[PDB]
Symmetry: D2
């Protein structure tokens, strides 16, 4: 019969700790911590990949089309964000190691680095970090540090469909964008154009003041932004610059879901969007906590490379965050009368 230690293959897991300081005849106690910490990180990366790959497959193989599967999708994404939340907290363990003490074994580590985490890279890639959007380290590609089946895996990760791509595809199919249907984008442009007109009238009416002057300038700004939403070419341009990532139609789908999130069919889809943003947030918080530690340990340069990874260029779903820019009054939102509610009702 099956025993715990065997079920968990602890013969492997708990015989994987080799202090290099010890191997070279100068055992340093805190090296053990350094080893375990990373090994735990790698376990959890493996788990995250497990969840993420599973969700990619649900999209890739069209199961997501069957909306019964949305609960599973959101659960696993949420689980990823829970794991990441932990991985952030896990830095607290390694903060128990002083720089002075780390200094006593750092030499036996050269020339190895976290940079060589295949899994971390797989994770970046599978979520949808693009190579053109990557900061080079020492003017080199991240993959040039990897060889063999490893380089092969990393390629597959780059070449196979990312979560971003798969979500984009799914977002494009969001119900309500059909011009022959609810014509969301049309109704939205109209309602915003109308609404803005109304507002300008209001402001013009205001008695010549400095508040008014301010309100006028504000209006100009908002009007610009709000209408920029309907400039597909602006989008295509911002896409090429990598300031956006999602297709124009995917963006429409996402905003559809934002605005109509209470409608039954969009309740769990809205949760998914939230979770995708959570993953981006937590990944960046991981990067920041990593930076903050490397600083404490090595001083001021990897530090600056790392500091550069704490940017929106590494946020895959930055588009979802930026939909907050285009928030309008609720009353401007195209009406979902019972008439046109049925298509979003399950």
């Amino acid at each position: 019969g099956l025993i715990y230690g065997n079920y968990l293959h602890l013969e492997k897991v708990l015989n994987a700790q080799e202090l290099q300081s010890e191997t070279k005849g100068n055992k340093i106690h805190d090296e053990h911590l350094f080893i375990i910490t990373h090994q735990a990180y790698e376990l959890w990366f493996k788990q995250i990949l497990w969840e993420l790959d599973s969700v990619r497959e649900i999209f890739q193989n069209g199961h997501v089309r069957d909306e019964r599967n949305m609960l599973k999708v959101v659960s696993r994404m949420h689980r990823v964000s829970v794991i990441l939340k932990l991985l952030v907290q896990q830095f607290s363990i390694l903060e128990t190691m002083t720089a002075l003490d780390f200094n006593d074994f750092r030499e036996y580590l050269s020339p190895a680095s976290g940079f060589q985490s295949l899994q971390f890279r797989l994770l970046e890639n599978k979520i949808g970090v693009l190579q053109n959007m990557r900061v080079p380290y020492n003017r080199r590609h991240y993959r040039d540090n990897f060889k063999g089946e490893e380089n092969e895996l990393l390629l597959k990760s780059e070449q196979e469909k990312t979560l971003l791509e798969l979500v984009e595809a799914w977002l494009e199919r969001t119900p309500g964008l059909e011009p022959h249907g609810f014509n969301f984008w049309g109704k939205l442009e109209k309602n915003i154009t109308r609404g803005l007109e109304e507002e300008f009238i209001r402001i013009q009416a205001k008695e010549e003041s400095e508040e008014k002057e301010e309100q006028v300038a504000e209006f100009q700004k908002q009007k610009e932004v709000l209408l920029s939403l309907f400039d597909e070419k602006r989008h295509e341009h911002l896409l090429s610059k990598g300031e956006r990532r999602l297709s124009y139609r995917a963006l429409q789908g996402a905003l559809m879901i934002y605005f109509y999130r209470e409608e039954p069919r969009f309740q769990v889809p809205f949760q998914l969007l939230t979770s995708l943003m959570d993953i981006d947030s937590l990944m960046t918080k991981w990067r920041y906590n990593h930076v903050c530690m490397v600083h404490r340990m090595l001083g001021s340069s990897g530090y600056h490379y790392l500091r550069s990874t704490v940017s929106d260029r590494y946020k895959v779903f930055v588009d979802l965050f930026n939909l907050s820019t285009y928030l309008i009054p609720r009353h401007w939102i195209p009406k979902m009368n019972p008439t046109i509610h049925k298509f979003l009702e399950h």
Copy 2:
């Protein structure tokens, strides 16, 4: 040169995941989570054992006598409590698994259980959980479930000196208890006896009242407690009953440190005492969070056994917690005379 994956023997760590559901031709997704969670726990237990064993050795080998080593001792104990804090939070990850989903692979796990965690047992033992006071599960001894070098290791863990025993030894050597020296115990008994007398007079003077009675009743209770501290035989009795764990002299040492904690030589010792209590607390919080989950997963015998492990019967440093019972007014505390104070400097 050295590569990350090799340094961390990831060839082992990341090839230790064997879904039994998959091995029996019915892969269940959430099983992977269950495996990784446990594997992470076991990594961290290993680290805790590493820290704990190191601190045990510092005591057993008299390095703790050189007070330079106190910083190291407290840091590592604190590190243990930081890890435990994390392990408690780690349950949040496994709470992402529904009971319904766990039910879909629980069959392939029989007859294995967490009970078979050698390391968890080693940890209990090395801290100082006593078998005499271990709740039996289904009329079984915990060790009877283990065989081979495992059973051997568990025995060694039981027989070799525990942290409690080693701390006890060290506490017995606490400066200030010397009757021919500061005579803390003597001065304390005197000051308490005197103080209590004084209070009684205060109350006796009061006029008969329900208040007076309420006060007299309280005084009797306090007097009882405070004086029970000087009944060595009561202690020896409670020791045999396992309601206390520390020698009478170790108890004196601990209270010495509590009362004079601001004195330089006692500052880090007091920190150590705090950390020992923290470890007990977090260990029991681990047990409670484990229970809370087994309930959500299996419903309500195991559950009840587990609920019973969340008791003071498992609290190794219960004596340190209970020194709060014997708090006296500050002014009752034997004054540290300038000459005397010298013995607590470095």
Copy 3:
């Protein structure tokens, strides 16, 4: 315009700290911490009541009948559990206060206690802690400590519909229980009866294993069939060992088993959140007890230790549905025919 400090009425919030040790001419530093900690707890209790009362209203006014409201309901319940998670962590702040230091101002507190938190009680009540099932303190009822409008509010809180009651009501209306419809309960009894038989046949196929298998089977059979004894339920209900109506229990199990069906996805989330709130409330109680121990020693401790029991778990029924888990293949197949109803 509006100023931050005024918007937040900080003239009140940040002039509410009066050290009693200082008022009596012996200021103790750590008293300040003790005050702030509690004040923060109370702020968050107020917020929890705000969320909880809002959700109660959505149920009581029948808005929950319109399923567009489910996202809001689950978000606010989830928000409650997030606040509670914080309130648990908040104990870590007060653990920075030593018992020795607390001892230096404890006297100036008498005879006040956390016990007198009106809000904590309102929260217990509004979730659905029953007075009859409350552990007595000092051989007396919790409310005897309260007077005036406070006692009045506490009564209202006890008498007005609890979250449990309102969820019960809603669970009773769960689709699928209709005997004329999917007849879940019927199909379930049948499928379990059948499934158990099939297992016995497997088992009937002598060994140590066999001995074990049959013992397991016996209990499982007992448990699973006990589910269909409405009388046992009504009995356990009167004993307060269960809380939900038998019909509500059917609704809940319906949702468990068919949770992936779109209409049940967010409802299942709600059930999970209700259990989370119970769990976190218990974790708060445990962390409270653990601290009172470190501070006062060894007995309110014992009273408190008694509050960490199933007597205080309002949705214990939802936790215990794990007992009645069956193989997936036993679950009545959700008719593609009528699937559209769900």
Copy 4:
């Protein structure tokens, strides 16, 4: 006798919630959360100020000279770190509010802002954030937004001695720096110079290239003028002597007299870290709520211009082999 609600003045605390959305006849549910969150933050800031001011006083009144007070000092600093850790987690509560929902009451807030947290500013100042090194928002001074007793308090907070200043003073008095005593700085320069030479005596090019880099850094430690210059720029904060005291404590931390002082240094760095983490978590949220200047201004607060104890972090840069560290034989350890 005393009642809980009265002891805690809950008549004030629990009657301080005024939804502006409600005051203007359009109550929005999530506004309540926004209010409470901030109120909780402010309570905890008050507590932090209480701890911090107490520690400042222990330094300023010379009690820290009596080393029995070090336990109290480190406990309270650690307590600050624990509160800050909580305040970081507290953002998770407000993350339960969607941008869509926040949008429904944001209007009733104009023109109010977190910027106007007197306490947050008092906290920045009392720790030792320098005004000249503060990034302007909208080409404006932070204090310009405050008037009355508030502006007065903020000034006092700027003018009275900061934690940094008080720690600096104390670090300068670290035992061991006496040239006539252990003569740490000399022993250090000597041992380093010697060891570096030996290394030179000993890919090879890259190693030599690295050695040159190393040597540069290590020797830069003894350039008092470089330091004084970097000090005036505000790229460093501590006096040259305080820096020596700190490094003394780093290297000899195991020595009993330095055990708790080393803990203090660690905690000062922890407070810097946690303050920055607060700033970052605030940013990461304003982004999800407002989208996009504020975000970027805030991203600028995650600069080391806001790290008061940056000197303590950077002592990791000047790390030598242990065997280079001047030996503390008990005779000269007697202290």
